[PDB]
Protein backbone atom coordinates (compact mmCIF):
# COMPACT_ATOMS: atom_id res chain seq x y z
CA UNK A 1 0.00 0.00 0.00
CA UNK A 2 0.69 3.61 0.51
CA UNK A 3 2.16 5.93 3.45
CA UNK A 4 0.23 9.28 4.50
CA UNK A 5 1.74 11.53 6.69
CA UNK A 6 -0.48 14.11 8.70
CA UNK A 7 0.60 17.50 9.50
CA UNK A 8 -0.47 20.10 11.76
CA UNK A 9 -2.46 21.33 9.80
CA UNK A 10 -5.94 20.31 8.31
CA UNK A 11 -5.35 16.86 6.03
CA UNK A 12 -7.36 15.12 4.06
CA UNK A 13 -5.88 11.56 3.40
CA UNK A 14 -7.47 9.08 1.14
CA UNK A 15 -5.90 5.67 0.96
CA UNK A 16 -5.04 2.94 -1.88
CA UNK A 17 -8.01 0.49 -1.10
CA UNK A 18 -5.00 -1.65 -0.34
CA UNK A 19 -2.06 -1.94 2.85
CA UNK A 20 -1.75 1.80 3.65
CA UNK A 21 -0.72 3.07 7.02
CA UNK A 22 -1.51 6.84 8.32
CA UNK A 23 0.86 8.51 10.38
CA UNK A 24 0.03 10.89 13.08
CA UNK A 25 3.15 11.78 14.86
CA UNK A 26 4.56 15.27 15.90
CA UNK A 27 6.21 18.02 13.88
CA UNK A 28 8.05 20.50 16.93
CA UNK A 29 6.41 18.57 19.39
CA UNK A 30 3.31 19.57 18.21
CA UNK A 31 0.66 17.25 17.54
CA UNK A 32 -0.31 16.06 14.18
CA UNK A 33 -3.60 14.82 14.60
CA UNK A 34 -5.58 18.38 14.90
CA UNK A 35 -9.18 20.40 14.05
CA UNK A 36 -10.65 19.14 10.96
CA UNK A 37 -8.46 16.29 9.70
CA UNK A 38 -10.20 13.29 7.95
CA UNK A 39 -9.55 10.10 7.00
CA UNK A 40 -10.42 7.87 4.95
CA UNK A 41 -9.20 4.08 4.08
CA UNK A 42 -10.66 1.89 0.89
CA UNK A 43 -9.45 -1.91 1.55
CA UNK A 44 -8.84 -3.80 5.06
CA UNK A 45 -5.28 -3.39 5.64
CA UNK A 46 -5.44 -0.31 7.07
CA UNK A 47 -3.51 1.42 9.91
CA UNK A 48 -3.04 4.71 11.92
CA UNK A 49 -0.25 5.35 14.41
CA UNK A 50 -0.56 8.44 16.22
CA UNK A 51 2.27 9.31 18.52
CA UNK A 52 2.69 12.21 20.84
CA UNK A 53 4.46 13.26 23.64
CA UNK A 54 1.32 15.21 24.66
CA UNK A 55 -1.30 13.31 26.76
CA UNK A 56 -4.07 12.37 24.72
CA UNK A 57 -7.49 13.51 26.11
CA UNK A 58 -9.90 13.59 23.09
CA UNK A 59 -10.29 13.21 19.69
CA UNK A 60 -9.93 16.58 17.88
CA UNK A 61 -12.95 18.98 17.05
CA UNK A 62 -14.38 17.60 13.36
CA UNK A 63 -12.07 14.98 12.91
CA UNK A 64 -13.34 11.83 11.71
CA UNK A 65 -11.44 8.25 10.74
CA UNK A 66 -13.29 6.06 8.88
CA UNK A 67 -12.37 2.89 6.45
CA UNK A 68 -9.29 2.62 9.31
CA UNK A 69 -9.07 -1.02 10.79
CA UNK A 70 -6.26 -0.71 13.55
CA UNK A 71 -5.96 2.51 15.72
CA UNK A 72 -2.36 2.24 17.33
CA UNK A 73 -2.52 5.54 19.94
CA UNK A 74 0.56 6.42 22.30
CA UNK A 75 1.80 8.44 24.76
CA UNK A 76 4.62 10.40 26.74
CA UNK A 77 1.55 11.07 29.26
CA UNK A 78 -1.75 10.07 29.53
CA UNK A 79 -4.25 8.43 27.86
CA UNK A 80 -7.95 9.34 27.69
CA UNK A 81 -10.46 8.34 24.57
CA UNK A 82 -13.73 7.04 23.79
CA UNK A 83 -13.77 5.45 20.07
CA UNK A 84 -17.79 4.30 20.42
CA UNK A 85 -18.08 7.76 17.96
CA UNK A 86 -16.16 9.76 15.22
CA UNK A 87 -14.39 6.48 14.45
CA UNK A 88 -16.12 3.96 11.88
CA UNK A 89 -14.51 0.69 10.52
CA UNK A 90 -12.31 -0.22 13.70
CA UNK A 91 -11.39 -3.67 14.72
CA UNK A 92 -8.80 -3.05 16.69
CA UNK A 93 -7.64 -0.29 18.84
CA UNK A 94 -4.27 -0.18 20.81
CA UNK A 95 -3.28 2.43 23.61
CA UNK A 96 0.42 2.35 25.31
CA UNK A 97 1.17 4.18 28.19
CA UNK A 98 4.64 4.37 29.94
CA UNK A 99 4.10 6.12 33.41
CA UNK A 100 0.72 7.40 33.55
CA UNK A 101 -3.07 6.54 33.53
CA UNK A 102 -5.15 5.14 30.86
CA UNK A 103 -8.69 5.42 30.57
CA UNK A 104 -10.33 3.81 27.43
CA UNK A 105 -14.02 3.34 26.31
CA UNK A 106 -14.51 0.85 22.77
CA UNK A 107 -17.17 0.77 20.48
CA UNK A 108 -17.83 -3.11 20.54
CA UNK A 109 -16.76 -4.80 17.34
CA UNK A 110 -13.50 -3.09 18.25
CA UNK A 111 -10.44 -5.16 20.05
CA UNK A 112 -9.05 -3.33 22.54
CA UNK A 113 -5.64 -3.50 23.79
CA UNK A 114 -4.08 -1.76 26.57
CA UNK A 115 -0.37 -1.96 27.32
CA UNK A 116 1.16 0.30 29.77
CA UNK A 117 4.77 0.01 30.96
CA UNK A 118 5.77 1.37 34.38
CA UNK A 119 2.13 2.04 35.60
CA UNK A 120 3.46 2.96 39.25
CA UNK A 121 0.69 4.41 41.26
CA UNK A 122 -1.53 5.45 37.76
CA UNK A 123 -4.91 3.78 37.41
CA UNK A 124 -5.70 1.53 34.27
CA UNK A 125 -9.59 1.45 33.60
CA UNK A 126 -10.55 0.07 30.35
CA UNK A 127 -14.51 -0.60 28.69
CA UNK A 128 -16.20 -1.81 26.22
CA UNK A 129 -14.62 -3.14 23.09
CA UNK A 130 -15.14 -6.76 21.91
CA UNK A 131 -11.84 -8.97 22.88
CA UNK A 132 -9.68 -6.83 25.58
CA UNK A 133 -6.31 -7.18 26.84
CA UNK A 134 -5.01 -5.07 29.56
CA UNK A 135 -1.00 -5.52 29.45
CA UNK A 136 0.39 -3.91 32.49
CA UNK A 137 4.24 -4.07 34.04
CA UNK A 138 6.16 -2.41 36.82
CA UNK A 139 2.80 -1.89 38.34
CA UNK A 140 2.72 -0.74 42.23
CA UNK A 141 -0.07 1.08 43.69
CA UNK A 142 -2.18 1.05 40.34
CA UNK A 143 -6.01 0.14 39.99
CA UNK A 144 -6.68 -1.92 36.88
CA UNK A 145 -10.45 -1.78 36.64
CA UNK A 146 -12.40 -3.13 33.22
CA UNK A 147 -15.72 -3.22 32.04
CA UNK A 148 -17.16 -0.82 35.11
CA UNK A 149 -19.00 1.14 32.98
CA UNK A 150 -19.46 -1.11 30.43
CA UNK A 151 -18.64 -5.06 29.35
CA UNK A 152 -16.66 -6.49 26.94
CA UNK A 153 -18.59 -8.61 23.55
CA UNK A 154 -15.80 -11.01 23.70
CA UNK A 155 -13.12 -12.11 26.34
CA UNK A 156 -11.13 -10.13 28.90
CA UNK A 157 -7.64 -10.57 29.47
CA UNK A 158 -6.08 -8.69 32.02
CA UNK A 159 -1.97 -9.36 33.11
CA UNK A 160 -0.33 -7.29 35.86
CA UNK A 161 3.51 -7.05 36.91
CA UNK A 162 5.12 -5.74 40.15
CA UNK A 163 8.27 -5.22 41.26
CA UNK A 164 7.98 -3.46 44.16
CA UNK A 165 7.37 -4.26 47.91
CA UNK A 166 4.32 -1.97 47.84
CA UNK A 167 1.46 -4.03 47.48
CA UNK A 168 -0.60 -4.58 43.62
CA UNK A 169 -3.60 -2.59 44.29
CA UNK A 170 -6.76 -3.84 43.05
CA UNK A 171 -7.80 -5.79 40.37
CA UNK A 172 -11.51 -5.72 38.95
CA UNK A 173 -13.52 -7.09 35.99
CA UNK A 174 -16.91 -6.76 35.08
CA UNK A 175 -18.41 -9.08 32.24
CA UNK A 176 -17.34 -11.02 29.15
CA UNK A 177 -17.66 -14.49 27.23
CA UNK A 178 -14.22 -15.33 29.70
CA UNK A 179 -12.21 -13.25 31.80
CA UNK A 180 -8.59 -14.28 32.84
CA UNK A 181 -6.97 -12.02 35.20
CA UNK A 182 -3.16 -13.51 35.48
CA UNK A 183 -0.87 -11.20 38.10
CA UNK A 184 3.01 -11.77 38.44
CA UNK A 185 5.02 -10.74 41.23
CA UNK A 186 8.98 -9.74 40.28
CA UNK A 187 10.35 -8.93 43.82
CA UNK A 188 13.86 -8.86 45.23
CA UNK A 189 14.79 -11.85 47.13
CA UNK A 190 14.89 -10.65 50.86
CA UNK A 191 11.13 -8.50 50.58
CA UNK A 192 8.20 -9.25 50.74
CA UNK A 193 5.21 -8.17 48.42
CA UNK A 194 1.78 -9.12 48.56
CA UNK A 195 -0.20 -9.05 45.68
CA UNK A 196 -3.18 -7.65 44.48
CA UNK A 197 -6.89 -8.52 45.18
CA UNK A 198 -9.17 -9.54 42.28
CA UNK A 199 -13.00 -9.53 42.18
CA UNK A 200 -14.39 -11.04 38.69
CA UNK A 201 -18.17 -10.36 38.60
CA UNK A 202 -19.68 -12.30 35.03
CA UNK A 203 -22.32 -10.84 32.63
CA UNK A 204 -25.12 -13.22 31.88
CA UNK A 205 -22.44 -14.46 28.41
CA UNK A 206 -19.58 -15.26 31.54
CA UNK A 207 -19.03 -19.00 31.08
CA UNK A 208 -15.64 -19.44 32.51
CA UNK A 209 -13.27 -17.57 34.53
CA UNK A 210 -9.28 -17.87 35.48
CA UNK A 211 -7.25 -15.93 38.25
CA UNK A 212 -3.30 -16.62 38.63
CA UNK A 213 -0.60 -14.99 40.73
CA UNK A 214 2.78 -15.79 41.81
CA UNK A 215 3.34 -19.24 44.62
CA UNK A 216 2.76 -17.66 47.52
CA UNK A 217 6.84 -18.12 49.91
CA UNK A 218 8.23 -16.79 53.42
CA UNK A 219 10.95 -13.77 52.53
CA UNK A 220 14.48 -15.45 53.10
CA UNK A 221 18.33 -14.60 52.65
CA UNK A 222 17.24 -15.86 48.87
CA UNK A 223 13.66 -16.42 48.70
CA UNK A 224 11.72 -13.73 47.41
CA UNK A 225 8.41 -13.47 49.75
CA UNK A 226 4.80 -13.06 48.29
CA UNK A 227 1.21 -12.86 49.99
CA UNK A 228 -1.47 -13.77 48.18
CA UNK A 229 -4.41 -11.59 47.31
CA UNK A 230 -8.11 -12.68 47.89
CA UNK A 231 -10.24 -13.33 45.11
CA UNK A 232 -14.15 -12.65 45.01
CA UNK A 233 -15.93 -14.59 41.45
CA UNK A 234 -19.65 -13.56 41.58
CA UNK A 235 -22.03 -14.92 38.56
CA UNK A 236 -24.95 -12.30 37.68
CA UNK A 237 -27.73 -14.06 38.79
CA UNK A 238 -26.08 -15.54 42.53
CA UNK A 239 -28.71 -12.98 44.04
CA UNK A 240 -31.62 -13.81 41.86
CA UNK A 241 -34.23 -16.85 42.81
CA UNK A 242 -34.90 -17.65 39.14
CA UNK A 243 -31.91 -16.56 36.93
CA UNK A 244 -29.64 -19.62 35.46
CA UNK A 245 -26.38 -18.16 36.34
CA UNK A 246 -23.39 -18.74 33.84
CA UNK A 247 -20.17 -19.45 35.56
CA UNK A 248 -19.47 -23.30 34.88
CA UNK A 249 -15.82 -23.15 35.13
CA UNK A 250 -13.37 -21.76 37.32
CA UNK A 251 -9.49 -21.82 37.35
CA UNK A 252 -7.26 -20.84 39.87
CA UNK A 253 -3.64 -20.38 40.14
CA UNK A 254 -2.45 -19.71 43.97
CA UNK A 255 -4.76 -17.76 46.06
CA UNK A 256 -5.34 -15.87 49.30
CA UNK A 257 -8.95 -15.75 51.02
CA UNK A 258 -10.80 -17.13 47.59
CA UNK A 259 -14.72 -16.60 47.10
CA UNK A 260 -16.94 -18.41 43.97
CA UNK A 261 -20.63 -17.72 43.84
CA UNK A 262 -22.41 -19.74 40.95
CA UNK A 263 -25.63 -21.86 40.76
CA UNK A 264 -24.45 -22.54 37.44
CA UNK A 265 -20.77 -23.76 38.83
CA UNK A 266 -19.13 -27.81 37.85
CA UNK A 267 -15.82 -27.12 37.88
CA UNK A 268 -13.16 -25.85 40.07
CA UNK A 269 -8.87 -26.14 38.99
CA UNK A 270 -6.61 -25.58 41.76
CA UNK A 271 -3.03 -24.80 41.69
CA UNK A 272 -0.14 -23.30 43.74
CA UNK A 273 -0.47 -21.92 47.00
CA UNK A 274 -3.86 -21.18 48.48
CA UNK A 275 -5.55 -20.17 51.75
CA UNK A 276 -9.31 -20.92 51.52
CA UNK A 277 -11.93 -21.66 48.87
CA UNK A 278 -15.54 -20.54 50.03
CA UNK A 279 -17.98 -21.90 47.17
CA UNK A 280 -21.52 -20.91 47.55
CA UNK A 281 -23.98 -21.38 44.20
CA UNK A 282 -27.07 -18.88 43.46
CA UNK A 283 -29.92 -18.41 45.80
CA UNK A 284 -31.73 -20.45 43.56
CA UNK A 285 -35.36 -21.33 45.91
CA UNK A 286 -35.77 -24.45 43.15
CA UNK A 287 -34.37 -27.54 44.45
CA UNK A 288 -31.03 -28.87 42.02
CA UNK A 289 -30.96 -32.12 40.59
CA UNK A 290 -27.23 -31.54 39.35
CA UNK A 291 -24.59 -31.44 42.60
CA UNK A 292 -20.98 -32.79 41.10
CA UNK A 293 -18.57 -30.65 42.26
CA UNK A 294 -15.50 -31.96 39.72
CA UNK A 295 -12.30 -30.43 41.77
CA UNK A 296 -9.20 -31.10 39.58
CA UNK A 297 -5.93 -30.50 41.60
CA UNK A 298 -2.36 -29.83 40.50
CA UNK A 299 0.76 -28.71 42.63
CA UNK A 300 -2.23 -27.38 44.78
CA UNK A 301 -1.37 -26.80 48.87
CA UNK A 302 -3.78 -25.54 51.07
CA UNK A 303 -3.38 -23.81 54.93
CA UNK A 304 -6.92 -24.07 55.44
CA UNK A 305 -10.57 -24.73 54.30
CA UNK A 306 -12.15 -25.71 50.91
CA UNK A 307 -15.52 -25.13 52.25
CA UNK A 308 -19.21 -26.15 50.65
CA UNK A 309 -20.66 -22.46 51.94
CA UNK A 310 -24.28 -23.86 50.66
CA UNK A 311 -24.48 -27.03 52.13
CA UNK A 312 -24.77 -26.05 55.45
CA UNK A 313 -28.16 -23.79 55.19
CA UNK A 314 -28.79 -24.91 51.47
CA UNK A 315 -28.49 -27.38 48.67
CA UNK A 316 -24.49 -28.31 48.38
CA UNK A 317 -22.78 -30.89 46.70
CA UNK A 318 -23.55 -34.78 46.92
CA UNK A 319 -20.87 -35.69 45.05
CA UNK A 320 -16.93 -34.27 45.46
CA UNK A 321 -14.75 -35.38 43.18
CA UNK A 322 -11.08 -34.50 43.09
CA UNK A 323 -8.58 -35.53 40.53
CA UNK A 324 -5.15 -34.98 41.70
CA UNK A 325 -2.89 -34.25 38.24
CA UNK A 326 0.77 -34.36 37.57
CA UNK A 327 1.83 -33.17 40.92
CA UNK A 328 0.64 -33.74 44.47
CA UNK A 329 -1.47 -31.53 46.18
CA UNK A 330 -2.55 -31.24 49.57
CA UNK A 331 -5.44 -29.66 51.32
CA UNK A 332 -5.04 -28.83 54.64
CA UNK A 333 -9.40 -29.09 55.31
CA UNK A 334 -11.98 -30.00 52.76
CA UNK A 335 -15.41 -29.40 54.48
CA UNK A 336 -18.59 -30.29 52.36
CA UNK A 337 -21.63 -30.69 55.07
CA UNK A 338 -23.95 -32.28 52.11
CA UNK A 339 -21.68 -34.58 50.59
CA UNK A 340 -22.49 -38.11 50.15
CA UNK A 341 -19.75 -39.99 47.59
CA UNK A 342 -15.75 -38.59 47.24
CA UNK A 343 -13.95 -40.14 44.02
CA UNK A 344 -10.37 -39.32 44.21
CA UNK A 345 -8.98 -39.85 41.00
CA UNK A 346 -5.98 -39.27 38.51
CA UNK A 347 -2.61 -39.05 38.34
CA UNK A 348 -0.70 -37.60 41.29
CA UNK A 349 -1.56 -37.75 45.06
CA UNK A 350 -4.01 -36.36 46.63
CA UNK A 351 -3.76 -35.57 50.56
CA UNK A 352 -6.85 -34.01 52.64
CA UNK A 353 -5.00 -33.39 56.20
CA UNK A 354 -8.58 -32.98 57.24
CA UNK A 355 -12.11 -33.63 56.11
CA UNK A 356 -15.22 -32.39 57.60
CA UNK A 357 -18.23 -34.21 55.75
CA UNK A 358 -20.91 -36.44 58.33
CA UNK A 359 -23.27 -37.64 55.60
CA UNK A 360 -20.44 -38.99 53.48
CA UNK A 361 -21.64 -42.91 52.83
CA UNK A 362 -18.48 -43.94 50.61
CA UNK A 363 -15.06 -42.55 49.74
CA UNK A 364 -13.36 -44.13 46.33
CA UNK A 365 -9.94 -43.76 45.65
CA UNK A 366 -9.34 -44.52 41.42
CA UNK A 367 -6.01 -42.73 41.59
CA UNK A 368 -2.77 -44.22 40.43
CA UNK A 369 -0.17 -42.75 42.75
CA UNK A 370 -3.09 -43.22 45.55
CA UNK A 371 -4.95 -40.73 47.87
CA UNK A 372 -3.92 -40.14 51.95
CA UNK A 373 -6.42 -38.60 54.40
CA UNK A 374 -5.62 -37.62 57.62
CA UNK A 375 -8.68 -37.52 59.63
CA UNK A 376 -10.02 -40.54 61.35
CA UNK A 377 -12.94 -42.04 58.81
CA UNK A 378 -16.34 -42.10 60.56
CA UNK A 379 -17.65 -45.86 62.51
CA UNK A 380 -20.15 -46.06 59.42
CA UNK A 381 -18.04 -44.94 56.33
CA UNK A 382 -16.98 -47.55 53.46
CA UNK A 383 -13.50 -46.74 51.58
CA UNK A 384 -12.24 -48.44 48.87
CA UNK A 385 -8.85 -48.37 47.61
CA UNK A 386 -6.92 -48.78 43.95
CA UNK A 387 -3.60 -49.20 42.69
CA UNK A 388 -1.11 -47.06 44.52
CA UNK A 389 -0.63 -46.42 48.14
CA UNK B 1 -10.63 16.51 -8.84
CA UNK B 2 -8.31 18.51 -6.80
CA UNK B 3 -7.91 19.51 -3.20
CA UNK B 4 -6.86 23.14 -2.57
CA UNK B 5 -5.05 24.71 1.03
CA UNK B 6 -6.26 27.42 2.63
CA UNK B 7 -3.51 29.54 4.82
CA UNK B 8 -3.74 31.94 7.28
CA UNK B 9 -2.62 34.37 4.49
CA UNK B 10 -4.89 35.94 1.58
CA UNK B 11 -5.53 33.00 -0.91
CA UNK B 12 -6.33 33.14 -4.54
CA UNK B 13 -7.71 29.85 -5.31
CA UNK B 14 -8.88 28.53 -8.57
CA UNK B 15 -10.23 25.21 -8.97
CA UNK B 16 -10.09 22.52 -11.86
CA UNK B 17 -13.67 23.05 -13.15
CA UNK B 18 -14.09 19.45 -11.64
CA UNK B 19 -14.60 17.40 -8.37
CA UNK B 20 -12.39 19.71 -6.07
CA UNK B 21 -12.47 20.30 -2.67
CA UNK B 22 -11.62 23.85 -0.90
CA UNK B 23 -10.22 22.94 2.69
CA UNK B 24 -10.07 25.88 5.03
CA UNK B 25 -8.84 24.01 8.26
CA UNK B 26 -6.38 25.29 10.79
CA UNK B 27 -2.70 25.91 10.64
CA UNK B 28 -1.33 26.70 14.56
CA UNK B 29 -4.63 26.19 15.91
CA UNK B 30 -5.21 29.49 13.31
CA UNK B 31 -7.99 29.73 11.41
CA UNK B 32 -7.24 30.33 7.39
CA UNK B 33 -10.61 31.50 6.16
CA UNK B 34 -9.07 35.00 6.59
CA UNK B 35 -9.16 38.73 5.09
CA UNK B 36 -9.54 39.16 1.34
CA UNK B 37 -9.24 35.28 0.66
CA UNK B 38 -10.96 34.95 -2.61
CA UNK B 39 -12.05 31.42 -3.99
CA UNK B 40 -13.53 30.48 -7.45
CA UNK B 41 -14.88 26.69 -8.38
CA UNK B 42 -15.57 25.93 -11.91
CA UNK B 43 -17.46 22.41 -12.33
CA UNK B 44 -20.08 21.52 -10.27
CA UNK B 45 -18.65 19.10 -7.73
CA UNK B 46 -16.99 21.90 -5.87
CA UNK B 47 -16.84 21.18 -2.04
CA UNK B 48 -15.64 24.30 0.81
CA UNK B 49 -14.58 22.62 4.07
CA UNK B 50 -14.54 24.96 7.04
CA UNK B 51 -13.52 24.09 10.29
CA UNK B 52 -12.29 25.86 13.63
CA UNK B 53 -12.06 25.47 16.77
CA UNK B 54 -12.62 28.83 17.22
CA UNK B 55 -16.21 30.21 17.00
CA UNK B 56 -17.07 31.33 13.97
CA UNK B 57 -18.36 35.17 13.52
CA UNK B 58 -19.16 36.10 10.58
CA UNK B 59 -17.70 35.81 7.08
CA UNK B 60 -14.37 37.63 7.10
CA UNK B 61 -13.53 41.16 5.25
CA UNK B 62 -13.07 40.69 1.41
CA UNK B 63 -13.97 36.93 0.92
CA UNK B 64 -15.32 36.11 -1.47
CA UNK B 65 -17.05 32.16 -2.28
CA UNK B 66 -18.06 31.77 -5.59
CA UNK B 67 -18.73 28.58 -8.11
CA UNK B 68 -18.64 26.57 -4.93
CA UNK B 69 -21.92 24.23 -4.57
CA UNK B 70 -21.39 23.11 -0.62
CA UNK B 71 -20.02 24.67 2.14
CA UNK B 72 -19.89 22.98 5.46
CA UNK B 73 -19.04 25.15 8.38
CA UNK B 74 -17.65 23.54 11.86
CA UNK B 75 -16.52 25.02 14.67
CA UNK B 76 -15.44 24.35 18.40
CA UNK B 77 -17.60 27.09 19.69
CA UNK B 78 -20.56 28.81 18.11
CA UNK B 79 -21.78 29.45 14.76
CA UNK B 80 -22.72 32.77 13.31
CA UNK B 81 -22.92 33.52 9.94
CA UNK B 82 -24.64 35.56 7.11
CA UNK B 83 -24.49 33.44 3.35
CA UNK B 84 -26.70 36.23 1.84
CA UNK B 85 -24.10 38.08 0.03
CA UNK B 86 -20.02 37.64 -0.81
CA UNK B 87 -21.51 33.85 -1.76
CA UNK B 88 -22.65 32.91 -5.17
CA UNK B 89 -23.47 30.05 -6.84
CA UNK B 90 -23.64 27.76 -3.68
CA UNK B 91 -26.64 25.21 -3.82
CA UNK B 92 -25.92 24.12 -0.18
CA UNK B 93 -25.25 25.57 3.20
CA UNK B 94 -24.43 22.88 6.00
CA UNK B 95 -23.36 24.41 9.48
CA UNK B 96 -22.38 22.69 12.58
CA UNK B 97 -21.89 23.01 16.30
CA UNK B 98 -21.60 20.87 19.16
CA UNK B 99 -22.43 22.25 22.40
CA UNK B 100 -23.37 26.07 21.79
CA UNK B 101 -25.59 28.39 19.90
CA UNK B 102 -25.85 28.90 16.11
CA UNK B 103 -27.42 31.70 14.15
CA UNK B 104 -27.24 31.45 10.08
CA UNK B 105 -29.31 33.27 7.61
CA UNK B 106 -28.35 31.59 4.36
CA UNK B 107 -29.60 33.10 0.60
CA UNK B 108 -32.50 31.93 -1.10
CA UNK B 109 -31.26 29.30 -3.41
CA UNK B 110 -29.44 27.83 -0.80
CA UNK B 111 -30.28 24.74 1.10
CA UNK B 112 -29.82 24.95 4.43
CA UNK B 113 -28.73 22.00 6.93
CA UNK B 114 -27.87 23.14 10.64
CA UNK B 115 -26.99 20.18 12.86
CA UNK B 116 -26.25 20.49 16.84
CA UNK B 117 -25.28 17.94 19.08
CA UNK B 118 -25.64 18.31 22.84
CA UNK B 119 -27.58 21.94 22.19
CA UNK B 120 -28.05 21.96 26.53
CA UNK B 121 -29.55 25.69 26.96
CA UNK B 122 -27.77 27.00 23.55
CA UNK B 123 -29.89 28.51 21.17
CA UNK B 124 -30.57 27.77 17.40
CA UNK B 125 -31.86 30.36 15.42
CA UNK B 126 -31.89 30.17 11.58
CA UNK B 127 -33.23 32.54 8.60
CA UNK B 128 -33.49 32.16 4.96
CA UNK B 129 -32.61 30.15 2.27
CA UNK B 130 -34.17 27.24 0.36
CA UNK B 131 -35.11 24.32 2.12
CA UNK B 132 -33.80 24.68 5.49
CA UNK B 133 -33.34 21.48 8.05
CA UNK B 134 -32.79 22.01 11.63
CA UNK B 135 -31.10 18.48 13.14
CA UNK B 136 -30.66 19.42 17.27
CA UNK B 137 -29.53 16.25 19.52
CA UNK B 138 -29.29 16.20 23.23
CA UNK B 139 -31.68 19.39 23.54
CA UNK B 140 -32.93 20.63 27.08
CA UNK B 141 -33.61 24.72 27.45
CA UNK B 142 -32.47 25.47 23.76
CA UNK B 143 -34.77 27.14 21.68
CA UNK B 144 -35.62 26.23 18.03
CA UNK B 145 -36.44 29.24 16.32
CA UNK B 146 -36.95 29.23 12.20
CA UNK B 147 -37.69 31.82 9.52
CA UNK B 148 -38.04 34.74 12.47
CA UNK B 149 -36.10 37.00 10.47
CA UNK B 150 -36.75 35.74 7.11
CA UNK B 151 -38.76 32.64 4.92
CA UNK B 152 -37.99 30.02 3.94
CA UNK B 153 -38.31 29.47 -0.39
CA UNK B 154 -39.10 25.65 -0.10
CA UNK B 155 -39.27 23.39 3.07
CA UNK B 156 -38.81 23.68 7.10
CA UNK B 157 -37.76 20.11 8.35
CA UNK B 158 -37.17 20.99 12.27
CA UNK B 159 -36.20 17.69 14.08
CA UNK B 160 -35.22 17.42 18.06
CA UNK B 161 -34.35 15.38 20.54
CA UNK B 162 -33.82 15.69 24.67
CA UNK B 163 -32.83 12.98 26.82
CA UNK B 164 -32.94 15.49 29.88
CA UNK B 165 -35.73 15.99 32.75
CA UNK B 166 -35.18 19.98 32.18
CA UNK B 167 -38.10 20.37 29.40
CA UNK B 168 -37.68 20.91 25.69
CA UNK B 169 -37.79 24.93 25.18
CA UNK B 170 -39.51 26.41 22.42
CA UNK B 171 -39.98 25.57 18.97
CA UNK B 172 -41.29 28.41 16.07
CA UNK B 173 -41.19 28.46 12.53
CA UNK B 174 -42.52 31.33 10.30
CA UNK B 175 -43.12 30.70 6.50
CA UNK B 176 -42.20 28.00 3.84
CA UNK B 177 -43.86 25.69 1.17
CA UNK B 178 -44.24 23.26 3.61
CA UNK B 179 -43.52 22.68 7.45
CA UNK B 180 -42.13 19.69 9.65
CA UNK B 181 -41.07 19.66 13.33
CA UNK B 182 -40.53 16.51 14.37
CA UNK B 183 -39.93 16.66 18.35
CA UNK B 184 -38.76 13.08 20.10
CA UNK B 185 -37.87 12.20 23.87
CA UNK B 186 -35.25 9.92 25.39
CA UNK B 187 -35.33 10.50 28.67
CA UNK B 188 -34.69 7.73 31.35
CA UNK B 189 -36.96 5.05 33.15
CA UNK B 190 -38.17 6.85 36.19
CA UNK B 191 -38.03 10.46 35.00
CA UNK B 192 -40.47 12.76 33.39
CA UNK B 193 -39.82 15.08 30.90
CA UNK B 194 -42.09 17.21 29.16
CA UNK B 195 -42.04 18.19 25.72
CA1 LIG C 1 -3.43 17.57 10.87
CA1 LIG D 1 -6.48 1.30 1.83
CA1 LIG E 1 -9.96 -0.06 5.12
CA1 LIG F 1 -26.67 -18.93 48.46
CA1 LIG G 1 -31.47 -22.63 47.35
CA1 LIG H 1 -28.02 -28.87 53.81
CA1 LIG I 1 -14.28 22.63 -10.13
CA1 LIG J 1 -6.58 32.46 4.19
CA1 LIG K 1 -18.52 24.54 -9.29
Do not use: C, Y
Amino acid sequence: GSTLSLTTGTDTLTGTANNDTFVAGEVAGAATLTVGDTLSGGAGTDVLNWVQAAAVTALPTGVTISGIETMNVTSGAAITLNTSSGVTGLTALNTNTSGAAQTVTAGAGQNLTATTAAQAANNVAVDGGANVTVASTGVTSGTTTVGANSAASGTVSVSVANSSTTTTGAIAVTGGTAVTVAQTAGNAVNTTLTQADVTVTGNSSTTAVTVTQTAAATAGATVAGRVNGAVTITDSAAASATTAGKIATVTLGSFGAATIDSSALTTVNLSGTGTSLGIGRGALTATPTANTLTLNVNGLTTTGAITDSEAAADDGFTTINIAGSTASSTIASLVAADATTLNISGDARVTITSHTAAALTGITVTNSVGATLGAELATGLVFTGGAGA
